[PDB]
């Protein structure tokens, strides 16, 4: 509050100097925009130059108020540069050493490793302070015991030269300046050098007390240091276990999924760096070989709907069947069915055109899936190696969403099962909850409802035409804003493969 | 509460001094078997058959002992430092016990208020950050 009324008066003076109500409101808008950390300081001062630049004094107040060669890496020294005399060199040292050729030059650590480094550095700093204090205490003790035997006449003219009879004259200076303050350290050192008789006993007493105080402080801090090390060292082993955790935390944002496809397009297909072949139609390739990975994930979903805090029973009973509906409609597995020259006959390739919501849901589906398809090729190998597992990981993942199992044990359970082969199954709950939330936002929205109805009508036809696809695109775009990014999904029944493409 | 502090302090000083003692044992551990072998050979009943052998064995024992005194005196020095430091630590410990047990005072009450401020300052260092 001491340094606020001055600013209030300065701003009142600025407002009076402006004099205009609307210009004052504009200046208020400018400073509010800066208050939201959106305007740079250089931009702020250049903007205020327009308003308060007329008053030099107020502008100054504001400005000072807001702030021959051989080898790849070796070069031959010239003849003049080869003469650096060394008296210790004998005949052998001359013959067997080189003086003509000189060499020339041509991963993110885990946060807990950084914390351990900081803790170790703090401990070593305390240890160095204590050891320097001990050495200085010993030096002062020997000086005091030497001077006490000395007579009074020699005590009166006793002068202490710099060094204090130590192997390093700078060792004790740091300790003295640490015990005292930096301003009095030089004075104390000078007094010790000039009046050792009266200075040595009292400074030695201060050192003796400070040794005990610092040791007690170190032993008090050691409680927190021990607790930090105990609770952090175990976590500080999984470099991949935490980096991929934060990657999964930052990945499933709405912008990022479309960023992947736009980036791969503009890099490989749109740019045509080769400039020799036409761009491929699609961008990403996906496969759905196994169908038993569907019932378990559906059970996980039903567990989340039966355990979620914020969902209504009429909503839950709908959600319990919506997932079955999409799986049956998309993968052909088990109006009433719906609620439960280009003409090609018996089509096997189908197209789904939709907005960001369906694309995000499908990307969540596929990101959950490729986490389980990778362990398919290693289940039997790890089953062999453990006794020298799918049901086990399934039942272990069951108990997290329903709350039976706490979050911690999930991470360590898979560690012994897979030392380095599996590092992507540690955040299943988050992706599952994201998928169920995105399914809910799919069903709730009316525009998404119309998109899903159009997809239903398109899929219900077993024969497509060239004009039918254009009609479908126009109909889906009729209720669709033009600015929204267009995507397309094609699913192949022949190979059970789903492809995607950015429009 | 001082009992806890002295319990922490005991092992550190004890271990520093024991490491020093281990170093002194290290610098002279290669002469104990030699000295014992020389003594046992001297005390053999079939040894006195040559006077020069007795003289040379006594000379060897004397040389070994002359080499062995320095380690022993350094051991006395470090053990004396051990004894005085441990005496101070035990003094603190049993004053702490006597004070804690005599009453199943305002000065030690103030230290709680002084530490309460530090605990309050450190707790608010995370809220204010």
């Amino acid at each position: 509050n001491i340094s606020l009324n001055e600013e209030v008066t300065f701003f009142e003076k600025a407002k009076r100097y402006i004099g205009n109500k609307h210009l004052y409101t504009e200046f208020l808008k400018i400073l509010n925009l800066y208050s939201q950390d959106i305007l740079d300081l250089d931009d702020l001062v250049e903007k205020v130059d327009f308003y308060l630049g007329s008053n030099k004094e107020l502008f100054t107040w504001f400005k000072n108020f807001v702030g021959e060669a051989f080898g790849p890496s070796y070069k031959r020294l010239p003849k003049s540069d080869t003469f650096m005399p060394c008296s210790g060199r004998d005949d052998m040292c001359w013959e067997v050493l080189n003086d003509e050729w000189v060499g020339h030059p041509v991963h993110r650590k885990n946060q807990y490793e950084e914390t351990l480094f900081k803790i170790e550095e703090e401990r070593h700093e305390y240890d160095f302070y204590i050891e320097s204090n001990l050495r200085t205490i010993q030096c002062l003790e020997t000086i005091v015991n030497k001077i006490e035997n000395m007579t009074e006449n020699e005590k009166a003219n006793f002068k202490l030269p710099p060094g204090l009879g130590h192997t390093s004259m700078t060792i004790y200076k740091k300790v003295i300046r640490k015990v005292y303050d930096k301003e009095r350290g030089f004075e104390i050192i000078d007094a010790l050098h000039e009046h050792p008789a009266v200075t040595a006993p009292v400074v030695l007493k201060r050192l003796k007390q400070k040794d005990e105080e610092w040791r007690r402080a170190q032993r008090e801090w050691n409680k927190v240091w021990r607790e930090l090390e105990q609770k952090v060292f175990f976590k500080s082993l999984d470099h991949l276990g935490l980096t991929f955790k934060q990657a999964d935390k930052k990945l499933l944002t709405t912008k990022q999924l479309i960023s992947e496809i736009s980036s791969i397009k503009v890099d490989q297909t749109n740019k045509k760096i080769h400039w020799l072949t036409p761009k491929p139609k699609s961008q990403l390739d996906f496969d759905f070989p196994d169908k038993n990975i569907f019932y378990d994930i559906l059970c996980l979903a039903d567990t989340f709907i039966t355990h979620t805090t914020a969902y209504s029973n009429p909503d839950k009973e709908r959600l319990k069947d919506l997932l079955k509906y999409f799986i049956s409609l998309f993968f052909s597995i088990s109006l009433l069915d719906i609620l439960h020259q280009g003409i090609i006959q018996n089509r096997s390739i189908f197209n789904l055109f939709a907005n960001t919501n369906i694309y995000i849901f499908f990307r969540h589906w596929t990101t959950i899936y490729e986490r389980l398809l990778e362990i398919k090729q290693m289940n039997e190998r790890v089953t062999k190696e453990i006794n020298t597992a799918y049901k086990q990981v399934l039942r272990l993942s069951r108990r997290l969403i329903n709350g039976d199992l706490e979050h911690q044990w999930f991470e360590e359970s898979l560690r012994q099962a897979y030392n380095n082969k599996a590092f992507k199954l540690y955040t299943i709950d988050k992706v599952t909850q994201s998928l169920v939330k995105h399914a809910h936002t799919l069903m709730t929205d009316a525009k998404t409802a119309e998109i899903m109805a159009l997809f239903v009508k398109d899929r219900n036809a077993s024969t497509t035409s060239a004009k039918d696809q254009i009609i479908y695109r126009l109909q889906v775009r009729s209720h669709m804003s033009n600015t929204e990014n267009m995507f397309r999904i094609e699913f192949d029944k022949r190979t059970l493969h789903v492809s995607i493409q950015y429009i | 509460n001082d009992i806890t502090d002295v319990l922490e302090e005991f092992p550190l000083a004890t271990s520093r001094y024991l490491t020093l003692l281990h170093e002194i044992d290290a610098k002279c551990v290669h002469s104990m078997p030699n000295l014992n072998e020389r003594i046992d050979k001297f005390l053999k009943k079939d040894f006195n058959k040559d006077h020069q052998t007795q003289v040379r064995l006594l000379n060897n024992i004397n040389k070994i002992y002359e080499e062995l005194m320095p380690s022993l005196e350094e051991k006395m020095h470090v053990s004396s430092i051990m004894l005085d430091n441990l005496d101070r630590l035990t003094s603190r410990l049993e004053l702490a016990y006597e004070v804690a047990i005599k009453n199943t005072p305002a000065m030690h009450l103030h230290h709680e208020l002084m530490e309460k401020i530090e605990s309050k300052s450190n707790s608010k260092s995370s809220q204010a950050l």
Binding site: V198, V202 | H110, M114
Partner: peptide
């Protein structure tokens, strides 16, 4: 008066003057 420092450092130099 219930201090910890800022007083003993003065008493150090105060003892020097006596």
């Amino acid at each position: 008066l219930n201090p910890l420092r800022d007083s003993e450092i003065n008493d150090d130099f105060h003892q020097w003057a006596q």
